[PDB]
UniProtKB/Swiss-Prot annotation:
Enzyme Commission identifier(s): 1.1.1.384
Active site residues of this protein: 95 (proton donor)
UniProt-annotated binding residues for substrate: 17, 222, 242
Protein name: dTDP-3,4-didehydro-2,6-dideoxy-alpha-D-glucose 3-reductase
Keyword Kinase in annotation: no
Amino acid sequence: NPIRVGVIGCADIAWRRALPALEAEPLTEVTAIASRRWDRAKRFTERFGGEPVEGYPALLERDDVDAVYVPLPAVLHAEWIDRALRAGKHVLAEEPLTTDRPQAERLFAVARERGLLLMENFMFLHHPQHRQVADMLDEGVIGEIRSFAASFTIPPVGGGALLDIGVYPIRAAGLFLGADLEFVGAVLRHERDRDVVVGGNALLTTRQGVTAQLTFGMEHAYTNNYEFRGSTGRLWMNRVFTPPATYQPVVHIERQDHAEQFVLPAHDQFAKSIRAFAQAVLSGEHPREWSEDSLRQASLVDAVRTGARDIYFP
Ligand SMILES: NC(=O)c1ccc[n+]([C@@H]2O[C@H](COP(=O)([O-])OP(=O)(O)OC[C@H]3O[C@@H](n4cnc5c(N)ncnc54)[C@H](OP(=O)(O)O)[C@@H]3O)[C@@H](O)[C@H]2O)c1
Ligand SMILES: Cc1cn([C@H]2C[C@H](O)[C@@H](COP(=O)(O)OP(=O)(O)Oc3ccccc3)O2)c(=O)[nH]c1=O
Ligand SMILES: Cc1cn([C@H]2C[C@H](O)[C@@H](COP(=O)(O)OP(=O)(O)Oc3ccccc3)O2)c(=O)[nH]c1=O
Ligand SMILES: [Cl-]
Ligand code: NA
């Protein structure tokens, strides 16, 4: 008996990743899609099934809905996740969960009181390539880790590039370097014209001095990678955040006089993360690490927003 999923917001990202996945996943059934415009709802249900609903409250009211996918704009997550939890729906919220740490704690508290799952959807965490990369690092392939770089940049209620893009490299640092990451300094470029963060660069460190240099933005050519400098080599990889389901990662390693590349298996991370959500909802095993990782994440992001030097242009 698959969990019945309602989607609120007919997002691009739901159109391209989440709904195809929801659709293909046995453990989940798309029962309802809601849109500010009935026609858009409808364009979406013709594609992926379910009842097209106009407005989001109406979908929260349905009894044929156990869980809600929220691919809305970041600044609008808090209202709707909070409303979906209050209607008794478990929630799968696109990254970032929300805009700040204190709002993230409140959404988790609302969920905790009702025993509902609130999961922040970082598709990338669900791709086995990261763990294959981490096992190589643990095996010593480049000796001790000295520092980490990650970059996600792309060509040009809005999030801004910190919230919508910066979050990836920052989560990757969190994933690889651990829970003690502290802000050191960052810069954020803001476009005066539309008043919006369009890119930036952050520097973090663990307490042992393993630094992370994270780049993000939307005024750039596409890059989507990370790099580990160790005491005896380096390791980098491309398409680390959004590898296609059929794309085979290639781990690049260099050491003195020697370089290697390892091709890894293809994996559907969007499928796997929908499956992970469905599993946690069906079993009621809601891993604590997830919510504690989201809280820590939200803190580094607030740390970056606040502590960054902000620069307006021109
Ligand atoms: N493409 C991206 O920008 C991007 C990149 C990485 C991550 N994400 C994450 O995925 C989530 C959604 O982004 P997306 O890329 O799929 O963006 P999108 O196409 O803007 O989707 C936002 C959707 O939310 C609904 N919405 C409700 N109020 C809105 C408003 N005032 N203005 C615009 N849309 C409104 C709209 O759905 P209805 O019209 O059907 O109501 C719209 O289709 C965000 O959390 C984002 O951080 C997005
Ligand atoms: C391959 C590729 C993409 N894009 C553009 C196309 C698109 O605008 C953007 C991201 O493409 P993707 O990494 O595929 O990420 P998702 O669409 O899954 O979702 C996100 C959207 C925005 C932020 C992050 C994820 O870069 C390019 O400009 N060049 C490329 O080679
Ligand atoms: C799934 C997932 C994890 N985490 C947190 C929870 C956990 O703290 C961390 C990773 O979760 P896991 O993918 O199970 O761990 P592996 O060893 O397989 O992958 C590694 C890959 C690289 C380096 C370390 C581990 O992210 C989340 O916040 N959300 C999620 O959806
Ligand atoms: Cl490559
Ligand atoms: Na600041």
